[PDB]
Design a protein around this motif. Structure first.
Motif: not given
Length: 470
Positions: A289-292, A337-344
């Motif tokens: 997700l971070a790469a995208l 959704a945790r990763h989406l939250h943390e990375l945005t």
């Protein structure tokens, strides 16, 4: 309108002060022994008194707990109620990395209590698992997932289900007395929040009608990420965003460009003017997700996320669900959704929209895993708002255009017209509401079916439900 009529929301209303007497019989308190140090867990154990019997639930071993509980039950005799403090275990299980330990242990407690023939009603306590009352802060979205599971326990094992109670930050003597009063008799309520001003209970209501000319939403632009955006509901969402003028849609799914219908979808989008990027990305894989996100145009920064990824398949009744099954249902909801939250959390997004389900808002028999996973989404959106971040949770009913689908329609959760569902979501986002359920209901079919074994205080604020019940 027709679209207003699909929108409902959860509210919390004040209920009666409970009585002043302790439960007459003996309580059984269940503690996760590595996670018994939180102030609230001490305050609860102290309020239950020293006559309460204590059971430490170690690990995740259904068969061993059934045997220990069977022994207590004969040694100690019948209990007034079972009070679980397992929600305090928020660390992820070591073998099931998408399942919080306390959620895994709550499922196994429900199952082992049935196995051992303990019939005292189970109450599951949380602290900061719901946002109840003006100003309230949902501090633990992980504990919020327990409410999704608990409501389905209530539908599948109504005779042995007590309910859910969220505690306040400080359990003072008024709080303690409210708790032990409710354990003595809760007057038919079963989704309760104890707060400084009183005891509040959970209610479903029709949402306020939408206001033309009052929209808060900034205009769609920049890059917008739609997880599960290659087909199904996420595909439909992407098409609306293209018509509303997104510059650039980033659509992900497990299959990406090989997803069914993906290519025809990209071609429909692009006919509209939109830059489309399709990626095979799984948001539960934080690196990917971070790469995208790292490759977004300088002239097309991320402005919104719509998280539609996640399957409902391979769930099972409470009495049968495995931890492996629960882990798979959790992964695309909690982990992603945790990763989406943390990375945005640092970007300054216009929208962060999590797609939940009626399974998590009112409860659906057969769907405990999917209810817990979608309840974490609703909880995370309330949590995000407490951080001053935007977030929205939209809990869908049935979409129009196998046996679980037909069961739901038969229970009066009717298939929606996609345009009306998508129209209602736009009304939600224009209002900048944090949470809603969007569903076509036949209350005459739904209310009686949902309440056949046990009454629901949830639906007392839906006048069609009150009418259907008499």
């Amino acid at each position: 309108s027709h679209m207003d009529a699909l929108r409902y929301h959860i509210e919390w209303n004040r209920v009666a002060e409970p009585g002043t007497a302790r439960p007459a019989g003996r309580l059984l308190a269940v503690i996760s022994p590595d996670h018994a140090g939180a102030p609230w867990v001490t305050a609860v154990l102290d309020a239950l008194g020293p006559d309460t019997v204590r059971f430490e639930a170690k690990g995740t071993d259904r068969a061993a707990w059934a045997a220990q509980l069977a022994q207590l039950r004969e040694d100690e005799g019948e209990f007034h109620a079972v009070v679980s403090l397992l929600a305090a275990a928020e660390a992820l299980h070591t073998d099931h990395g998408s399942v919080p330990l306390g959620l895994a242990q709550t499922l196994l407690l429900a199952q082992a209590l049935g196995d051992a023939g303990l019939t005292a009603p189970l109450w599951c306590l949380t602290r900061g698992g719901v946002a109840a009352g003006r100003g309230d802060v949902l501090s633990s979205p992980v504990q919020g997932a327990l409410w999704g599971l608990g409501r389905v326990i209530g539908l599948e094992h109504p005779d042995r289900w007590g309910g859910l109670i969220d505690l306040p930050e400080t359990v003072d003597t008024r709080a303690a007395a409210r708790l032990t009063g409710l354990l003595a008799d809760a007057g038919g309520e079963d989704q309760l929040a104890i707060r400084g001003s009183g005891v509040l209970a959970r209610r479903l209501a029709h949402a306020a009608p939408a206001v033309p000319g009052s929209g808060k939403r900034p205009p769609v632009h920049g890059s917008v990420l739609v997880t599960g955006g290659t087909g199904g509901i996420g595909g439909r969402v992407a098409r609306r965003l293209a018509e509303q003028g997104a510059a650039h849609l980033v659509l992900t799914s497990r299959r990406g460009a090989d997803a069914p219908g993906a290519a025809e979808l990209r071609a429909e989008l692009e006919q509209l003017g939109v830059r489309v990027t399709i990626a095979a990305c799984d948001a539960a894989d934080r690196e990917a997700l971070a790469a995208l996100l790292a490759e977004l145009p300088e002239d097309a920064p991320l402005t919104a996320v719509f998280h539609s990824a996640g399957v409902a398949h391979d769930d099972a009744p409470v009495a049968d669900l495995t931890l492996g099954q629960l882990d798979a249902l959790m992964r695309a909801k909690l982990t992603a959704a945790r990763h989406l939250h943390e990375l945005t959390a640092d970007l300054d997004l216009d929208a962060f929209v999590l797609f939940s389900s009626g399974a998590a808002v009112w409860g659906s028999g057969g769907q405990p895993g999917y209810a817990a996973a979608n309840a974490y989404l609703d909880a995370l959106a309330e949590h995000r708002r407490s951080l001053g971040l935007t977030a929205s949770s939209v809990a869908w009913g049935t979409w129009g255009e196998p046996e679980v689908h037909d069961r739901l329609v038969r229970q009066g959760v009717l298939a929606m017209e996609p345009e009306h569902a998508l129209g209602a979501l736009d009304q939600m986002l224009e209002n900048d509401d944090t949470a809603a359920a969007i569903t076509l209901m036949d209350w005459e079919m739904f209310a009686p079916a949902f309440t056949a074994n046990r009454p629901s205080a949830l639906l007392s604020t839906v006048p069609e439900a009150v009418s259907a019940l008499s």
